[PDB]
Structure formats: C-alpha cells, structure tokens
Structure 1
Amino acid sequence: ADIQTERAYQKQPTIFQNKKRVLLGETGKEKLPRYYKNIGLGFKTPKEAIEGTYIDKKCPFTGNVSIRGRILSGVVTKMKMQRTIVIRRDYLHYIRKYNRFEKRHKNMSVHLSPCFRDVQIGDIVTVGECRPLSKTVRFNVLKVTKAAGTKKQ
C-alpha cells in the first residue's frame, strides 16, 4: 500500500515537504505538492501522474528524464521485470535481389512508468527515447493504447 518500501527515503528532489507545520498548517489535512511536467509533440499527461502518489526518477512525467530523439511503437510481449517491460517492433525488410520482403523483428526493453494501469499482454505502446537508463533500457513509455480488451467475462 505505502510507497516508502525501499531502504532510503524516496522523494522528489525538487519539491520541499516540511513547510512549517504550525497552528496554521495542521496535520489533519496533509498533502504534498506534486511535481509533474508536460512533454511536447502532443502527448498528454495521465491523471495518475498528477493525482498519483508514486515516485520514479525514470518516469517521463515526474522524473528527471527528457524525451528527445526517435519516437517508435510496438507490442507488449512480456510484462515481467518491475518498472521495465519488453516490447517487440515487427517490421519487413526488403531484399532487392529476390524482389520480396522478409518478416524480421527485434525487441527492445523500455521503461514502463507506473502511471499506467491496464498494460497487459499484447497492447500497442508508442515509445519515445532519451538518455541511457540501464544497460539496455534506452527508451521510455509515453502512451499505452489498449488492445484485446474492453469486455472480459
């Protein structure tokens, strides 16, 4: 339930929390101001990046990462691995000797921010790129767009 589950105090490095809890500022109604930003190239900010309560350095909507560069799209093929999913971008490569195409793929590890809930197996996700985040994770999840759902019994 709670957020402080690591072994250091997770917080956002920019907002200041402890602003003079006195007889004016009561501990009965206690929020903290939530830092988010906006990405350009027409990408909205999900409600759970504003009214959410999580913490992620690597989230594009509350961390210190900035998308600029290529923008791609893929299919979520494996959703293990906390805050980092694997997506597969299938494509066709053209061999001009045989005048035909060749169904290739290469999959790619991307940082899934926890401002997205209904990210299940086989969904379409547009993905932007940034600085290197890990050994292999260079790209970052901007906007899921669902598949295979909207009614399940």
Structure 2
Amino acid sequence: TVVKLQSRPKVGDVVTLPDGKKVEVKNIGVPYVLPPAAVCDDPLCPWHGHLKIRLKLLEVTVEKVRMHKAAVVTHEWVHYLPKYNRYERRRRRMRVRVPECIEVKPGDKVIIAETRPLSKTIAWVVIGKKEDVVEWKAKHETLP
C-alpha cells in the first residue's frame, strides 16, 4: 500500500508497486512543495489519489500521532490587545489527515492544506513536511 523510494520522484512520474498497480504522482497545483519520497495508493491522498485541495496553506507542528492516518497538530499565531498595546501568543489544536506516503513525528513542522471534509473533525491534510518546501517567486514582466 505504501512503497518507499530510494530517491524522490517528480510530478507526472508513474511508479508501479509490488502489486503491479501503476501510481502517477499527480500535480496538486502547489509548485513550492515537493512530492513525498514514497508512494501510496490511497484514493483520498492528494499526491496519489483523487483528493483535491484548496490553495490555503498553513504551517503547523505535529503533536500526537496515534490516530490511524491522522495526527494532532498545533497552530500558532500572535494576537494584539489594543488596551495594553502588547501581544499574546495563541495556539489551537487541529486534527489533520496524514497520508501513508508521508511520515510524521511529534514536534515536526509540516504543511497542511484545506480540502473537503473527510471526517467529523478532519478537513485538512498534510501536504508535506517543511523540508520539502522550495523557494518560489512569481514572474515580473515589464515593458521598458
């Protein structure tokens, strides 16, 4: 169901598991995240399945990985209090979907993307760890 790889593939590659099924690393529309270093066959996977994500991305840290194909991550931000003119650090725990091709541990910073709802509390999925990010810039064409 999950076959690891000695090297990472690219978007559009087709890799066949020991079962002989061919899985193509789809293009999830986010060009600054690398595909996982292993392949799964889950139809709810965004890399190797039919799952479609939205363009909302968040960077969180894994807290509890003891649910099946899911994890408990923490989301952090800073809130301004106008009366005191100071900040407060707020955090919220979210439930997210962890695909089989992506392995996570507590304390690790991952990337999540909003999808359609998958369970009572899961609507976000781990797109990939932070280290699979890549620097990206837009295009700036100008007529002199």
The structure with higher relative contact order (CA 8 Å, sep 6+) is 2
Matched, 1:94 2:83: no
Matched, 1:75 2:61: yes
Aligned equivalent of 1:40, options 10, 29, 32: 29
Return 5+ residue gaps in structure 1 as ranges: 4-28, 147-153
What is the Cα deviation at residue 102 of structure 1? 1.2
For 1:85-124, list aligned pairs within 5 A: 85-117=71-103, 119-124=104-109
CA contact (8 A) 1:38 1:44 kept: no
Q: Deviation digits for residues 31-75 of structure 1, max 9, x if unmatched? A: 2222431112212222312xxxx4323211122211114110101
CA 1:30–1:61 in structure 2 vs 1: closer, same or farther (change >3 Å)?
A: closer
TM-score (norm 1): 0.67
- Give the letter for the 2:30 counterpart: L
CA contact (8 A) 1:58 1:111 kept: no
Say how many residue pairs are matched.
Answer: 114
Matched-pair identity in %: 34
Aligned-pair Cα RMSD in Å = 1.9
What is the Cα deviation at residue 116 of structure 1? 1.7
Task: Return the alpha-carbon distance in structure 2 between the equivalents of residues 129 and 61 of structure 1.
Answer: 14
Task: Return the alpha-carbon distance in structure 1 between the equivalents of residues 122 and 50 of structure 2.
Answer: 15
TM-score (norm 2): 0.71
Aligned equivalent of 1:145, options 119, 123, 130: 130
